């Protein structure tokens, strides 16, 4: 792995310091339907004319990004994404900007959110949950080795490709950091104590988020929830948890080691690294190289209703994509 | 029950950051 990782660090850095920009134009894409929405902008299922391929295009309004004080995060997530490369990470195929917005055209993952599937099925068996955890454990091992902290792990942020494999794609809260950072960001249920308590936190949080994910996947509901954030934060800082009776002892002991309020005790954060996790009884069954290789059989496989079928997808108000006749926020995004 | 409390919490849909 170290051998693999050191060769990737090298790949990462080359792109990280000499990124890429203006790899395509908007005139060469046919918008199909909105798939996501928010303060950032909006992700859209698109079709490449000359090729006919389907891509997920994220459109950001420049003036708005400025207004909301999001120019650093906006350049950071696009910088991180054109530089990472892992089997479970969504590649960014193209990226340009015009007199109005910034565009990030990624690989379209058609199986949608793991969230949709989890709320429908109820809960996930441990082997099914584990299948996914395994893919997350690897993607953090990687990301972390590049001194990148993820901090935005949650079902709604995890997609399932056609082979039934997990795909991470949103790097808005990602931070290039070797030591500690302080910002408060994430989703209440996935926040680690230390992020709540206004403490300097490291990459260990991403490991807390995993124990949470593995818990919500096997149980169907998060380890700490409540009516409002504040009461959750409260639940969390107590690090007091109860497990569904069906949970295996092994799945329980792994979670007691992941959801550990004592940082000096958190797995993936101890002295032996991720191997404390990779080597946990719960993962005995896991074939780490086959998972990497994608040689393992998904326990669930979306069966698309054709290329770019978006029927099992919620709808959104389609807004026109306007582009100003005059430049907008030039200087602030010259790095895009 | 926990599943029961979960529903009552109202945080059973997509959560924002």
Describe the structure.
The complex is a heterodimer of chains A (about 325) and B (about 15). Chain A is globular and about 60 Å long. Chain A has helices spanning about 1-15, 60-65, 70-80, 115-120, 125-145, 195, 205-220, 230-235, 250-260, 275-280, 290-295, 330-335, and strands at about 30-35, 40-50, 55-60, 90-95, 100-105, 150, 160, 165, 175. Chain A is α+β, with helices and mostly antiparallel strands. Chain A is about 35% helix and about 15% strand. Chain A has twelve helices and nine strands. Chain A folds into two domains: about 1-20 and about 115-305, Transferase(Phosphotransferase) domain 1 (Transferase(Phosphotransferase), domain 1), CATH 1.10.510; about 20-110 and about 305-335, Phosphorylase Kinase, domain 1 (2-Layer Sandwich). Chain B is mainly α. Chain B is about 45% helix and about 0% strand. Chain B contains one helix and no strands. In chain B, about 5% of the residues are buried. The interface of A and B includes residues 119, 152, 227 and 242 of A. Chain B: This is cAMP-dependent protein kinase inhibitor alpha. Chain B: It comes from Homo sapiens (Human). Chain B: Belongs to the PKI family.
Shape of chain A: globular
Largest sheet of chain B: none
How many E strands of chain A? 9
Strand content of chain A: 5-15%
User: In the CATH hierarchy, what is the architecture of the largest domain in chain A at level 2?
Assistant: Orthogonal Bundle
The H/E string of chain B reads H
How are helices and strands ordered from N to C of chain A?
HEEEHHEEHHEEEEHHHHHHH
Category from helices, strands and their pairing of chain A = alpha+beta
CATH class of the largest domain in chain A: Mainly Alpha
Q: Indicate the percent of residues in helices of chain A.
A: 25-40%
């Amino acid at each position: 792995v170290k051998e693999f990782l050191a060769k990737a660090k090298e790949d990462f850095l080359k792109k990280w310091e000499n990124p890429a920009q203006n790899t395509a134009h908007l005139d060469q894409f046919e918008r199909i339907k909105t798939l996501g929405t928010g303060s950032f902008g909006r992700v859209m299922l698109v079709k490449h004319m000359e090729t006919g391929n389907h891509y997920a295009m994220k459109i950001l309004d420049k003036q708005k990004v400025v207004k909301l004080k999001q120019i650093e995060h906006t350049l950071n997530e696009k910088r991180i994404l054109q530089a990472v490369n892992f089997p479970f990470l969504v590649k960014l195929e193209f990226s340009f900007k015009d007199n109005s917005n910034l565009y990030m055209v990624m690989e379209y993952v058609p199986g949608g959110e793991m969230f949709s599937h989890l709320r429908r099925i109820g809960r996930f068996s441990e082997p099914h949950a584990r299948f996914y955890a395994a893919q997350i454990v690897l993607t953090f091992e990687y990301l972390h080795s590049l001194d990148l902290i993820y901090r935005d792990l949650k079902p709604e942020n995890l997609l399932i490709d056609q082979q039934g494999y997990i795909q991470v794609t949103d790097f808005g809260f990602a931070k290039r950091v070797k030591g500690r950072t302080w910002t408060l960001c994430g989703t209440p249920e996935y926040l680690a104590p230390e992020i709540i308590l206004s403490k300097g936190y490291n990459k260990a949080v991403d490991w807390w988020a995993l124990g949470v994910l593995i818990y919500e996947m096997a149980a169907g509901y998060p380890p700490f929830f409540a009516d409002q954030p504040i009461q959750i934060y409260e639940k969390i800082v107590s690090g007091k948890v109860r497990f569904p009776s069906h949970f295996s002892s092994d799945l329980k002991d792994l979670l007691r080691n992941l959801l550990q309020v004592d940082l000096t005790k958190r797995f993936g954060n101890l002295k032996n690294g991720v191997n404390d996790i990779k080597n946990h009884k719960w993962f005995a069954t896991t074939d780490w190289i086959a998972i990497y290789q994608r040689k393992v059989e998904a326990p669930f496989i979306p069966k698309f209703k054709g290329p770019g079928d978006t029927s099992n997808f919620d709808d959104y108000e389609e807004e026109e994509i306007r582009v100003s006749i005059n430049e907008k926020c030039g200087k602030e995004f010259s790095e895009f | 029950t926990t599943y029961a409390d979960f529903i009552a919490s109202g945080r059973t849909g997509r959560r924002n950051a």
